[PDB]
Amino acid sequence: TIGMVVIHKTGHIAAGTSTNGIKFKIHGRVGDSPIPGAGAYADDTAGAAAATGNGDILMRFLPSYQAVEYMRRGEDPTIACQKVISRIQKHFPEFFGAVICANVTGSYGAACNKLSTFTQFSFMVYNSEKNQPTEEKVDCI
Amino acid sequence: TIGMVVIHKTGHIAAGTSTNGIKFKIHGRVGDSPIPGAGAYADDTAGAAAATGNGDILMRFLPSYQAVEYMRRGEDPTIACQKVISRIQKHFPEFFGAVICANVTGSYGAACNKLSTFTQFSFMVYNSEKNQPTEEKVDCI
Amino acid sequence: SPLPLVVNTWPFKNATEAAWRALASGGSALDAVESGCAMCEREQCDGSVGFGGSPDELGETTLDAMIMDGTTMDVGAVGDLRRIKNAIGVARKVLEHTTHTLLVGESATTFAQSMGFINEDLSTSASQALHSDWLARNCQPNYWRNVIPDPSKYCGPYKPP
Amino acid sequence: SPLPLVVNTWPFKNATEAAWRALASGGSALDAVESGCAMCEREQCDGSVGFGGSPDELGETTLDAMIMDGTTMDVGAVGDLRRIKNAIGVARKVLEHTTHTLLVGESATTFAQSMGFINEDLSTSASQALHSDWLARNCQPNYWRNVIPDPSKYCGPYKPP
Ligand SMILES: *[C@@H]1O[C@H](CO)[C@@H](O[C@@H]2O[C@H](CO)[C@@H](O[C@@H]3O[C@H](CO)[C@@H](O)[C@H](O)[C@@H]3O)[C@H](O)[C@H]2NC(C)=O)[C@H](O)[C@H]1NC(C)=O
Ligand SMILES: *[C@@H]1O[C@H](CO)[C@@H](O)[C@H](O)[C@H]1NC(C)=O
Ligand SMILES: *[C@@H]1O[C@H](CO)[C@@H](O)[C@H](O)[C@H]1NC(C)=O
Ligand SMILES: *[C@@H]1O[C@H](CO)[C@@H](O)[C@H](O)[C@H]1NC(C)=O
Ligand SMILES: N[C@@H](CC(=O)O)C(=O)O
Ligand SMILES: N[C@@H](CC(=O)O)C(=O)O
């Protein structure tokens, strides 16, 4: 899955995803990806977020909607994302999942669940700051 | 659509909906009803909520989820449901939508956007005190 | 304050009580939510639940339905269920028999069939009568925009401008 | 903190590149997000995006995609999009030519053909084989539960005991 967040020069935000799903899914299965509030969410008055991972589990907690909801409440993009991972985490300690967060002013961040086989989440950031995209990695929690 | 919320005596909660969509929808259209968090959402640590109305607008605001998040603060059901309707109301002054809320103790409530063709919402209720299913009603805001 | 509790949208009494009876026999909340909702499927509550109503542009009836286990927070959902009546019935089956949340379309029909659900046309003369008058009203209303021929005046098939 | 800003999941440099180029050309967030994801569909980023990857139980690949405008807060989405490679392209259409939000399955394919999308096979000898290796391993892993034969050991057809 590719989850993307974009804030136009004029301050407009958009979020989107495109995926082929999880391997060997039951014929007809739709995950969290095309679901507003689950796979991605965008709000010009708050921010945007996008999740990736075990959609079956993810979908049921609306990660992107809650990441934006916290940033709307006025929270650091990273802290909004980490809180979202912590809430699902409490319910599924071994769930595979990662989220990217970004507020209306251009600050961003991410968070992920710490598993034996996934301790870092790499995500691409392209910004005026560095006219060139640069991969970033956040340690999982 | 029939949005239904149930709280067993043990204190365990359930929620659900069933519908046939909106008349003359494009072949293959799916709305808020089957989407967890939008058409209905239930959590044993806070409460539940179901929604009915125009699924195309509602689905983007995850009414059932947000109603539950308010109640998760201890917000009164009528108010959590009322606040939700208002968030949507800002963006689409003419939206058709109604939601029923109930917290973990058995307190219920409901709310609806006031349109000149939708001014009051009737919902059924069933609990000990009354026994006999009682038809409630709320004036739209 | 007084438990148990049942709350449904719209004045569907027969459903409310079908749910209470479920609780009466010491059924689970989930059991109660399936019985109440499914009851409106048979009754086609206000023609907004169940078969024989709300036909899409092609005249077919497609059902959406979900059920959520508040304890584990597990979901059973169907979107675009074709040729299967007990929509929420199929939804409990996704909760109970797969680690998934949502299955859709003719694919969800094949799953439903394995679960023992009877494949059958969801159309009635009434559902079609509604479809024909619509065609006669130039498919008004409809949900298209920015397509030729004008969506507000003509029926499709439409093409992007 | 300075704009514009493009952030995406995974080290998918090319998608990031594709989206940024949209904005440079005067494109909008929507065009930027569509370019980013459409790029990962052609490249099949990790085989977790686009065609020829993650085949279901019947060996078919089905795509899920969505686009969301934060200004109007409108959404265009597709689920179980069958036989169409540019998923995010079709989702953008549901957003601009319909008042709906989600279109799924083989019904969504029709829509995409109406919009001008080439109806084609999403299978590839790679995914075709990825599925046979899967079947030879007795369908492991799968997402069933509470059925027979035991999902932890055998292939389907499954059924409730
Ligand atoms: C988007 O997220 C960023 C990062 O969380 C927010 O930026 C931070 O903004 C705060 C509030 O302006 C700044 O801290 C304040 O620092 C001043 C120093 O003069 C002090 O007076 C206050 O007591 C507090 O410490 C902080 O420096 C700044 N951090 C960064 C990294 O930029 C931003 O406000 C968020 N935007 C929105 C619209 O929510
Ligand atoms: C349920 O609603 C009433 C009214 O708001 C409130 O007093 C009660 O404490 C609520 N339940 C919980 C668990 O907060
Ligand atoms: C249940 O409700 C329907 C809906 O109008 C009504 O026609 C029917 O008589 C009721 N059935 C029973 C057993 O009361
Ligand atoms: C991105 O760059 C190349 C350039 O065409 C492309 O083949 C591939 O998708 C990506 N390459 C690598 C090494 O990630
Ligand atoms: N979210 C995808 C999986 C992923 O992000 O890789 C799905 O479950 O459909
Ligand atoms: N929410 C349903 C319609 C309704 O509940 O009235 C739908 O749009 O699918």
XYZ file of C-alpha atoms and ligand atoms in Angstrom:
703
model
C 0.000 0.000 0.000
C 1.081 3.539 -0.811
C -0.504 6.167 1.457
C 0.166 9.756 0.455
C -0.277 13.183 2.020
C 0.104 16.469 0.112
C -0.233 20.110 1.170
C -0.388 22.547 -1.756
C 1.561 25.819 -1.723
C -1.796 27.537 -1.115
C -2.447 25.409 1.965
C -4.875 22.891 0.449
C -4.469 19.253 1.570
C -5.143 15.899 -0.092
C -4.645 12.297 0.937
C -4.859 9.070 -1.008
C -3.955 5.410 -1.228
C -3.592 2.672 -3.790
C -3.003 -0.984 -2.934
C -3.441 -4.572 -4.083
C -4.377 -5.595 -0.536
C -3.017 -8.328 1.720
C -1.618 -11.566 0.293
C -4.023 -14.440 -0.263
C -7.063 -12.408 0.770
C -10.457 -14.049 0.538
C -11.955 -13.292 -2.872
C -13.913 -10.035 -2.474
C -12.107 -8.598 0.557
C -11.809 -4.825 0.913
C -9.422 -3.483 3.518
C -8.850 -0.115 5.197
C -7.260 1.495 2.171
C -10.237 2.962 0.254
C -12.077 3.748 3.481
C -12.206 7.473 4.446
C -10.863 7.809 7.942
C -9.027 4.472 7.841
C -6.543 4.400 4.970
C -6.282 8.175 4.660
C -7.964 11.426 5.686
C -7.472 15.060 4.687
C -8.829 18.220 6.326
C -7.676 21.755 5.443
C -8.659 22.990 8.910
C -6.684 20.324 10.787
C -4.260 18.223 8.743
C -3.886 14.833 7.121
C -2.781 11.293 7.893
C -2.451 7.917 6.196
C -2.021 4.404 7.570
C -0.485 1.203 6.202
C -0.466 -2.366 7.493
C -2.863 -5.087 8.592
C -5.985 -3.378 7.269
C -8.411 -5.816 8.911
C -7.228 -4.657 12.309
C -6.447 -1.066 11.298
C -9.798 -0.308 9.715
C -11.657 -0.935 12.942
C -9.898 1.914 14.771
C -9.956 4.628 12.044
C -6.254 5.623 12.515
C -6.219 8.462 10.005
C -9.387 10.040 11.336
C -8.016 9.988 14.880
C -4.587 11.303 13.841
C -6.281 14.306 12.225
C -8.692 14.602 15.146
C -5.757 14.988 17.577
C -3.944 17.454 15.309
C -7.259 19.315 15.167
C -7.200 19.362 18.976
C -3.780 20.935 18.538
C -1.179 18.175 18.782
C 2.341 17.648 17.420
C 2.048 15.551 14.196
C 4.359 12.908 15.667
C 2.515 12.820 19.022
C -0.839 12.535 17.223
C 0.489 9.577 15.225
C 2.076 7.859 18.250
C -1.106 8.134 20.234
C -3.013 6.448 17.423
C -0.512 3.559 17.344
C -0.691 3.250 21.140
C -4.490 2.874 21.204
C -4.584 0.059 18.639
C -1.437 -1.344 20.267
C -3.281 -1.762 23.553
C -5.890 -3.844 21.700
C -3.483 -5.737 19.362
C 0.160 -5.736 20.605
C 1.437 -7.618 17.554
C -0.456 -5.816 14.830
C 1.481 -4.634 11.755
C 0.794 -0.952 11.150
C 2.349 2.447 10.400
C 0.923 5.955 10.089
C 2.135 9.266 8.642
C 0.857 12.552 10.042
C 1.084 16.194 8.974
C -0.550 19.416 10.178
C -1.871 22.317 8.080
C 1.373 24.273 8.480
C 3.636 21.671 6.927
C 5.019 19.841 9.937
C 4.841 16.054 9.689
C 5.717 12.812 11.485
C 4.981 9.096 11.796
C 4.748 6.192 14.232
C 4.603 2.418 14.055
C 4.232 -0.684 16.112
C 7.323 -2.414 17.369
C 7.472 -6.028 16.318
C 10.281 -8.560 16.418
C 10.603 -8.016 12.659
C 9.746 -4.307 12.214
C 11.476 -1.731 14.371
C 11.861 1.095 11.856
C 9.415 2.753 9.478
C 10.901 4.493 6.477
C 8.770 7.068 4.649
C 9.547 9.595 1.912
C 9.470 13.331 2.503
C 9.839 15.859 -0.301
C 9.857 19.470 0.742
C 11.124 22.930 -0.293
C 13.598 22.616 2.596
C 15.492 20.020 0.541
C 14.665 20.240 -3.161
C 15.097 16.450 -3.401
C 13.042 13.721 -1.642
C 14.632 12.257 1.481
C 13.815 8.970 3.199
C 13.137 9.203 6.935
C 12.862 6.456 9.543
C 11.091 6.523 12.901
C 11.746 3.924 15.556
C 8.641 1.892 16.369
C 6.864 1.987 19.740
C -31.650 1.613 7.061
C -32.115 0.168 10.508
C -29.349 1.241 12.842
C -29.437 -0.860 15.975
C -27.553 -0.679 19.231
C -27.723 -3.280 21.976
C -26.267 -3.425 25.462
C -26.664 -6.845 27.132
C -26.999 -7.022 30.904
C -23.428 -8.309 31.240
C -22.592 -4.869 29.891
C -21.345 -6.131 26.531
C -22.244 -3.975 23.547
C -23.203 -4.691 19.951
C -24.269 -2.533 16.989
C -25.369 -3.098 13.425
C -27.183 -1.901 10.324
C -28.769 -3.347 7.204
C -29.866 -1.407 4.161
C -30.457 -1.435 0.403
C -28.783 1.941 -0.212
C -30.282 5.121 -1.602
C -32.656 5.001 -4.555
C -31.149 4.956 -8.028
C -27.558 4.707 -6.830
C -24.870 3.972 -9.442
C -24.321 0.239 -9.998
C -21.949 -0.888 -7.274
C -22.324 1.990 -4.862
C -21.649 1.288 -1.158
C -22.342 3.861 1.557
C -21.786 4.407 5.292
C -23.972 1.552 6.549
C -21.428 -1.334 6.254
C -18.433 0.842 7.148
C -17.371 0.390 10.799
C -17.107 3.746 12.537
C -19.473 5.392 10.035
C -22.704 3.389 9.799
C -22.232 1.961 13.287
C -19.477 1.484 15.904
C -19.462 -0.122 19.342
C -16.913 -0.257 22.191
C -17.306 -1.883 25.595
C -15.221 0.841 27.244
C -17.408 3.733 26.086
C -20.593 2.919 24.230
C -22.134 2.641 20.779
C -23.817 4.612 18.010
C -25.520 4.030 14.653
C -26.369 6.414 11.805
C -28.999 6.815 9.138
C -29.317 9.376 6.350
C -27.259 10.269 3.301
C -24.358 7.845 3.407
C -22.253 9.734 0.831
C -21.836 12.745 3.141
C -21.923 10.872 6.466
C -19.275 8.330 5.553
C -16.701 11.142 5.355
C -17.350 12.340 8.898
C -17.447 8.950 10.667
C -20.432 10.012 12.846
C -20.779 6.750 14.795
C -17.089 6.711 15.700
C -16.933 10.347 16.781
C -20.157 10.017 18.804
C -18.443 7.229 20.715
C -15.236 9.286 21.236
C -17.219 12.073 22.865
C -18.978 9.572 25.103
C -15.518 8.136 25.830
C -14.887 11.456 27.617
C -18.127 10.955 29.512
C -20.186 13.235 27.273
C -23.928 12.681 27.595
C -25.326 10.634 24.628
C -27.718 13.364 23.443
C -24.767 15.766 23.378
C -22.192 13.466 21.753
C -24.800 12.748 19.070
C -25.636 16.499 18.876
C -21.997 17.611 18.556
C -21.450 15.146 15.699
C -24.440 16.459 13.742
C -23.039 19.970 14.173
C -19.588 19.143 12.778
C -21.193 17.960 9.584
C -23.725 20.808 9.649
C -20.931 23.337 9.169
C -19.739 21.705 5.957
C -23.083 20.722 4.478
C -25.880 22.871 5.961
C -28.493 20.782 4.128
C -27.351 17.226 4.980
C -29.848 14.474 5.757
C -28.619 12.569 8.766
C -29.676 11.131 12.104
C -27.735 9.309 14.799
C -28.590 7.391 17.987
C -26.066 7.241 20.879
C -25.893 5.184 24.075
C -23.125 5.017 26.696
C -21.968 2.019 28.720
C -24.538 2.553 31.485
C -27.702 2.458 29.425
C -28.134 6.187 28.760
C -29.398 6.924 25.241
C -30.075 9.905 22.985
C -30.327 10.933 19.376
C -29.827 13.913 17.101
C -30.659 15.098 13.582
C -29.912 17.949 11.171
C -32.980 20.151 10.723
C -34.173 20.405 7.156
C -37.533 21.855 6.192
C -38.422 18.278 5.163
C -36.955 16.581 8.254
C -37.691 18.242 11.572
C -38.093 15.346 13.970
C -36.465 11.908 14.394
C -38.322 8.932 15.886
C -36.402 5.975 17.267
C -37.427 2.920 19.211
C -36.255 2.137 22.750
C -36.395 -1.027 24.838
C -35.198 -1.403 28.434
C -36.462 -2.816 31.757
C -38.287 0.152 33.396
C -40.646 0.507 30.428
C -40.301 -3.006 29.085
C -42.666 -2.640 26.013
C -40.746 -1.027 23.092
C -41.187 2.740 23.406
C -41.022 5.147 20.464
C -38.823 8.132 21.280
C -38.465 11.368 19.260
C -36.092 14.342 19.052
C -36.424 17.700 17.378
C -33.708 18.273 14.804
C -31.122 21.014 15.326
C -29.359 3.119 33.689
C -31.709 0.105 33.336
C -30.136 -2.778 31.361
C -30.350 -4.544 29.020
C -31.077 -1.976 26.290
C -32.084 -1.930 22.624
C -32.186 1.162 20.396
C -32.968 1.209 16.691
C -33.451 3.948 14.114
C -36.942 4.735 12.851
C -40.243 3.402 14.313
C -39.509 -0.270 13.570
C -41.255 -1.920 16.576
C -41.310 -5.460 15.194
C -37.485 -5.299 15.010
C -37.030 -3.841 18.490
C -38.976 -6.704 19.956
C -37.325 -9.327 17.729
C -34.129 -8.087 19.390
C -35.604 -8.161 22.905
C -36.875 -11.731 22.416
C -33.278 -12.576 21.520
C -32.140 -11.126 24.855
C -35.109 -12.737 26.630
C -33.830 -16.214 25.695
C -30.442 -15.181 27.082
C -29.049 -14.452 23.652
C -25.871 -12.393 23.149
C -26.044 -8.716 22.243
C -24.672 -9.747 18.847
C -27.460 -12.296 18.540
C -29.959 -9.555 19.346
C -28.474 -7.177 16.782
C -28.630 -9.821 14.060
C -32.243 -10.796 14.850
C -33.549 -7.256 14.928
C -31.835 -6.130 11.743
C -32.708 -9.316 9.851
C -36.331 -8.908 10.900
C -36.453 -5.680 8.873
C -34.973 -7.576 5.951
C -38.056 -9.799 5.815
C -40.368 -6.820 6.337
C -38.380 -4.613 3.969
C -38.740 -1.856 6.552
C -39.913 1.277 4.726
C -38.459 -0.317 1.626
C -35.091 0.908 2.946
C -34.010 -2.446 4.335
C -33.985 -5.797 2.596
C -34.742 -6.839 -0.964
C -37.374 -5.528 -3.366
C -36.604 -1.859 -2.964
C -34.106 0.939 -3.659
C -32.961 -0.284 -7.106
C -29.690 0.957 -8.574
C -29.431 2.532 -12.006
C -29.509 -0.928 -13.621
C -32.567 -1.947 -11.601
C -30.744 -4.335 -9.267
C -30.981 -4.294 -5.485
C -27.691 -4.496 -3.612
C -27.391 -4.795 0.188
C -24.959 -3.372 2.755
C -24.858 -4.527 6.359
C -22.523 -4.757 9.315
C -22.362 -5.968 12.899
C -19.753 -5.047 15.493
C -18.646 -7.101 18.479
C -18.143 -4.448 21.146
C -16.055 -6.720 23.325
C -13.309 -7.681 20.847
C -14.161 -4.878 18.405
C -14.511 -7.351 15.561
C -16.554 -6.450 12.505
C -18.531 -8.497 10.014
C -19.488 -6.481 6.935
C -20.981 -6.819 3.460
C -21.067 -4.093 0.885
C -22.766 -4.599 -2.466
C -24.125 -8.069 -1.595
C -25.732 -9.447 -4.745
C -28.494 -12.093 -4.957
C -28.513 -12.827 -1.193
C -31.359 -11.738 1.097
C -30.098 -12.186 4.686
C -27.494 -9.420 4.405
C -26.683 -9.036 8.109
C -26.778 -12.833 8.298
C -23.858 -12.921 5.861
C -22.209 -10.154 7.918
C -22.176 -12.295 11.144
C -20.570 -14.982 8.988
C -17.661 -12.675 8.052
C -17.163 -11.805 11.726
C -17.451 -15.432 12.840
C -15.593 -17.165 9.985
C -12.866 -14.944 8.568
C -10.246 -12.649 10.059
C -11.505 -9.978 7.629
C -13.863 -7.043 8.090
C -15.532 -6.357 4.704
C -16.289 -8.480 1.611
C -18.142 -7.004 -1.355
C -20.036 -7.775 -4.571
C -20.619 -11.006 -6.454
C -17.569 -12.301 -4.551
C -19.443 -11.866 -1.244
C -22.271 -13.872 -2.904
C -19.937 -16.828 -3.441
C -18.859 -16.575 0.217
C -22.456 -16.328 1.361
C -23.316 -19.435 -0.711
C -20.615 -21.473 0.995
C -22.011 -20.282 4.313
C -25.239 -21.904 3.169
C -27.089 -18.773 2.061
C -29.566 -19.226 -0.784
C -28.721 -17.325 -3.963
C -31.828 -15.626 -5.232
C -32.987 -12.609 -7.187
C -33.722 -9.646 -4.922
C -36.164 -8.064 -7.415
C -39.931 -7.766 -7.159
C -42.424 -6.377 -9.633
C -42.624 -3.363 -7.315
C -38.871 -2.761 -7.324
C -38.940 -2.777 -11.116
C -42.073 -0.630 -11.355
C -40.043 1.971 -9.503
C -37.163 1.506 -11.950
C -39.328 2.010 -15.054
C -41.039 5.226 -13.870
C -37.569 6.580 -13.142
C -36.448 5.767 -16.665
C -39.584 7.602 -17.794
C -38.602 10.624 -15.727
C -35.221 10.705 -17.510
C -33.398 9.139 -14.623
C -34.120 11.986 -12.267
C -32.711 12.087 -9.770
C -29.323 10.433 -10.309
C -25.766 10.766 -8.991
C -23.632 11.841 -11.912
C -21.986 15.196 -12.629
C -19.684 16.560 -15.340
C -20.542 13.988 -17.992
C -22.333 14.060 -21.339
C -25.248 13.848 -21.881
C -26.345 16.336 -19.202
C -27.046 14.287 -16.010
C -29.819 16.670 -14.973
C -31.785 16.086 -18.152
C -30.880 12.739 -19.719
C -30.426 9.088 -18.825
C -27.055 7.465 -19.530
C -24.770 5.763 -20.564
C -22.668 8.868 -19.905
C -19.112 9.719 -21.028
C -16.759 12.231 -19.401
C -16.856 15.656 -21.087
C 7.369 23.804 7.696
C 7.530 25.556 4.331
C 5.160 24.354 1.583
C 4.371 22.461 -0.560
C 4.673 19.164 1.294
C 4.582 15.612 -0.022
C 4.786 12.769 2.494
C 4.160 9.106 1.587
C 4.448 5.713 3.231
C 7.546 3.645 2.478
C 10.848 4.475 0.795
C 9.114 4.837 -2.621
C 11.369 7.614 -4.027
C 9.781 7.591 -7.483
C 6.239 8.185 -6.181
C 7.514 11.086 -4.121
C 9.233 12.327 -7.250
C 6.128 11.956 -9.413
C 3.914 13.870 -6.977
C 6.356 16.734 -6.501
C 6.606 17.178 -10.265
C 2.823 17.610 -10.469
C 2.899 20.512 -8.023
C 5.841 22.073 -9.838
C 3.885 22.036 -13.112
C 1.134 23.989 -11.417
C -0.750 20.880 -10.387
C -2.898 20.635 -7.259
C -2.688 18.399 -4.216
C -5.190 16.098 -5.935
C -3.090 15.834 -9.102
C 0.002 15.394 -6.903
C -1.528 12.539 -4.914
C -2.892 10.907 -8.050
C 0.532 11.079 -9.735
C 2.278 9.642 -6.719
C 0.016 6.621 -6.383
C -0.491 6.089 -10.096
C 3.276 5.852 -10.320
C 3.392 3.041 -7.724
C 0.756 1.133 -9.753
C 2.962 1.129 -12.887
C 6.040 0.251 -10.877
C 4.140 -2.230 -8.696
C 5.968 -0.862 -5.614
C 6.877 -3.970 -3.565
C 4.124 -5.865 -5.288
C 1.883 -4.423 -2.585
C 0.538 -1.815 -4.973
C -0.783 -2.221 -8.525
C -1.383 -5.289 -10.654
C 0.405 -8.611 -10.609
C 0.757 -8.941 -6.853
C -1.108 -10.187 -3.760
C -3.500 -12.583 -5.557
C -6.554 -13.624 -3.616
C -7.608 -17.233 -3.046
C -8.783 -17.598 -6.650
C -5.520 -16.088 -7.947
C -7.043 -12.766 -9.039
C -5.576 -9.406 -8.009
C -8.099 -6.769 -6.924
C -7.208 -3.139 -6.219
C -8.308 -0.791 -3.451
C -7.714 2.940 -3.863
C -8.977 6.296 -2.616
C -8.454 9.998 -3.084
C -9.605 12.705 -0.729
C -9.863 16.438 -1.112
C -9.287 18.170 2.231
C -10.919 21.378 0.994
C -14.370 20.105 0.045
C -13.769 16.912 2.027
C -15.105 14.889 -0.884
C -13.835 11.405 -1.625
C -13.489 9.175 -4.639
C -12.820 5.523 -3.852
C -12.776 2.019 -5.320
C -12.726 -1.366 -3.653
C -12.377 -4.772 -5.321
C -11.730 -2.889 -8.556
C -11.542 -5.741 -11.028
C -9.592 -5.784 -14.309
C -8.477 -2.106 -14.258
C -4.833 -1.204 -13.540
C -5.084 2.519 -12.730
C -7.016 2.243 -9.474
C -6.337 5.787 -8.211
C -7.371 7.038 -11.655
C -10.823 5.492 -11.307
C -11.183 6.767 -7.726
C -10.485 10.301 -8.869
C -13.375 9.846 -11.341
C -15.864 8.691 -8.673
C -14.909 11.949 -6.907
C -15.435 14.167 -9.985
C -18.337 12.496 -11.829
C -20.464 11.221 -8.988
C -21.831 12.411 -5.670
C -21.058 8.937 -4.244
C -17.968 7.990 -2.288
C -17.370 4.289 -2.837
C -17.904 2.035 -5.862
C -16.847 -1.622 -5.603
C -16.326 -4.937 -7.429
C -17.206 -5.846 -11.017
C -19.755 -3.061 -10.888
C -16.904 -0.569 -10.394
C -15.203 -2.016 -13.517
C -18.169 -1.074 -15.651
C -17.855 2.459 -14.310
C -14.151 2.608 -15.206
C -14.884 1.393 -18.741
C -17.485 4.139 -19.052
C -14.767 6.588 -18.003
C -12.311 5.294 -20.559
C -10.228 2.768 -18.676
C -8.920 -0.242 -20.570
C -10.500 -3.419 -19.289
C -7.606 -5.849 -18.867
C -6.189 -8.800 -16.962
C -4.276 -7.875 -13.796
C -2.568 -11.312 -13.570
C 1.071 -11.925 -14.402
C 2.998 -15.188 -14.607
C 4.633 -14.027 -11.342
C 1.386 -13.736 -9.381
C 0.063 -16.722 -11.282
C 2.883 -18.815 -9.804
C 2.807 -17.088 -6.422
C -0.682 -18.597 -6.185
C 0.225 -22.156 -7.238
C 3.069 -22.295 -4.722
C 0.430 -21.167 -2.229
C -2.018 -23.927 -3.235
C 0.708 -26.602 -3.104
C 1.446 -25.569 0.470
C -2.178 -26.454 1.252
C -3.253 -22.809 1.144
C -1.004 -21.495 3.893
C -1.579 -18.891 5.148
C -5.212 -17.993 4.706
C -7.681 -15.863 6.669
C -10.426 -18.320 7.586
C -11.474 -19.515 11.020
C -13.988 -21.732 12.841
C -14.541 -23.970 9.782
C -13.686 -27.382 8.298
C -11.410 -28.613 7.004
C -9.009 -27.027 9.487
C -7.695 -23.754 7.942
C -4.399 -24.245 9.761
C -3.719 -27.331 7.661
C -5.860 -27.683 4.535
C -7.152 -25.791 1.492
C -10.839 -24.993 1.020
C -13.743 -25.135 0.140
C -14.492 -24.305 3.750
C -17.711 -24.586 5.685
C -19.063 -24.143 9.217
C -18.926 -27.398 11.242
C 2.308 22.014 13.437
O 3.259 21.272 14.223
C 4.384 21.996 14.725
C 5.209 20.989 15.548
O 4.530 20.463 16.687
C 3.930 23.240 15.517
O 5.146 24.068 15.711
C 5.511 24.509 17.057
O 4.724 25.606 17.367
C 4.794 25.981 18.729
C 3.574 26.856 18.902
O 3.880 27.939 18.066
C 6.241 26.528 19.080
O 6.555 26.488 20.526
C 6.253 27.642 21.421
O 7.613 28.103 21.401
C 7.574 29.481 21.852
C 8.982 30.071 21.662
O 8.794 31.471 21.443
C 7.055 29.590 23.324
O 6.594 30.950 23.448
C 5.844 28.609 23.690
O 5.634 28.473 25.163
C 6.139 27.245 22.957
O 7.345 26.584 23.415
C 7.267 25.550 18.541
O 8.522 26.263 18.589
C 6.929 25.008 17.115
N 7.799 23.877 16.806
C 8.208 23.648 15.565
C 9.100 22.417 15.469
O 7.879 24.357 14.613
C 2.838 24.076 14.768
O 2.302 25.133 15.590
C 1.729 23.157 14.321
N 0.763 24.014 13.604
C -0.530 24.120 13.885
C -1.318 25.080 13.006
O -1.069 23.472 14.778
C -24.181 7.923 30.647
O -25.011 9.130 30.588
C -25.261 9.906 31.818
C -25.745 11.254 31.318
O -24.636 11.875 30.692
C -23.982 10.028 32.767
O -24.327 10.523 34.078
C -23.352 8.663 32.943
O -22.332 8.715 33.968
C -22.911 8.182 31.530
N -22.077 6.969 31.662
C -20.745 7.027 31.734
C -20.012 5.731 31.872
O -20.106 8.078 31.688
C -44.682 -5.732 11.900
O -44.543 -4.491 11.165
C -45.041 -4.454 9.769
C -44.579 -3.122 9.086
O -45.736 -2.272 8.769
C -46.614 -4.671 9.832
O -47.245 -4.539 8.553
C -46.840 -6.066 10.510
O -48.202 -6.219 10.813
C -46.141 -6.178 11.877
N -46.096 -7.599 12.188
C -46.472 -8.076 13.374
C -46.399 -9.581 13.694
O -46.935 -7.362 14.271
C 12.806 4.318 -8.855
O 13.797 4.687 -9.865
C 13.915 3.899 -11.044
C 14.020 4.983 -12.190
O 13.332 4.641 -13.418
C 12.721 2.838 -11.144
O 13.169 1.858 -12.027
C 12.270 2.104 -9.848
O 10.855 2.142 -9.734
C 12.815 2.777 -8.662
N 14.166 2.248 -8.504
C 14.663 1.915 -7.312
C 16.091 1.361 -7.319
O 14.034 2.072 -6.256
N -3.414 -1.600 4.119
C -3.201 -2.724 3.166
C -1.932 -3.495 3.531
C -0.690 -2.629 3.471
O -0.768 -1.439 3.869
O 0.369 -3.132 3.027
C -4.406 -3.634 3.235
O -4.596 -4.273 4.287
O -5.168 -3.659 2.253
N -27.229 5.568 5.048
C -27.907 4.785 3.994
C -29.273 5.384 3.710
C -30.057 5.667 4.974
O -29.636 5.228 6.072
O -31.096 6.355 4.879
C -27.055 4.808 2.746
O -26.859 5.905 2.181
O -26.549 3.732 2.382
